[PDB]
Amino acid sequence: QFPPIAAQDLPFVIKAGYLEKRRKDHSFLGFEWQKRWCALSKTVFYYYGSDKDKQQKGEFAIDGYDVRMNNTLRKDGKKDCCFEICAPDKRIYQFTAASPKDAEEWVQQLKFILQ
Template identity: 35%
Template structure:
C-alpha cells in the first residue's frame, strides 16, 4: 500500500457533504502532506483533496449511523468544513491508513497517542520558507512572532488567506528556529516540499518547519 514517501490504495468513500449518499470506490493517495482521492487510478486530476494542516482528527468510525455490513471498517477524517468517511476492506488496512494520515496531520489541537491512551494534547503550527522569497505561517503563533517576521514590512507585502498568513520577506531557517524557540515552541520536523505561491497560481519550492507546544499554554503576545 505504501512507498517510502507515498501511501496509495483503493478505499470506499461515503458520498455527500453530510455523508448521506452511497459508497463510491476511490483511488486514494497520501503524498506531500495532502490526501487526494480519485475516481480512477489512471486519473490525473483528483476528485478531492484534504490538506494535512486542515485535519483535526483521524479515527475509526464509532457512529452507528455510518456503519454498513458491506463496509465494516470505516474511518473518519475531520476538517473544519466537514467529516469525510472512508472505508477499508480489512481492519489492518484501515488502521494503517489512520496511522499514515495521522502522522502527517498538523491540526490545531492534536492528541498524541501511546497505544490507546492520550499522553499529551499539542497545538501544531507550520512555517513555510519559500526558496526565492516569502514566508507563510499556518496556525496561531501569536502576535509577537508575526511582528518579528514582518518587521520593517509594509501592509502591501502581507496577506492573509485560507492557507495562512503570508509575508513577502527574506528570512532564514536559523532565524525562524531561534524566534520560535524563544517564544516557547518546540521544533518537530523540517522538510523540502512544494507549496502554493501567494497568488495561488503555481507550486513553488519551499522548506516547511513544524513546531508544537502544549495546547494549554497561553501564546505570548496574545
C-alpha cells in the same frame, strides 16, 4: 489543494490505495459508498476514479484535521473497516477500507503525519 494533477504524476506518495468514500449528502441511486483511488501526497489527500486518471475528483489538505476509526458509519459487517478525517469546522471525509488492518494502516499513517 487546487491544480489538476494525474494520479501517477503525484509527488512523494506516502500511501495510496482504493477506499470507498462516503457521499457528501443523501439522494444517491445505488450507493452512498464509492470506490476511489486515494493518495496521500505529502500533506494533501487526493482522490480519484482510478489510479490512472489524469485529474482528481477532489483533494484536501490534512492541516488541523484529526483521524479516527468510526464503526458507526455503516450498519453492515464492513463497519469495522470505517474511518474518518474530521474537525469541528471542516468538511468531514469518511471512508471504508478493505479490512480492519488496512483501515488501521491508513489511520496510523495519517496520524504519524499529523504530528
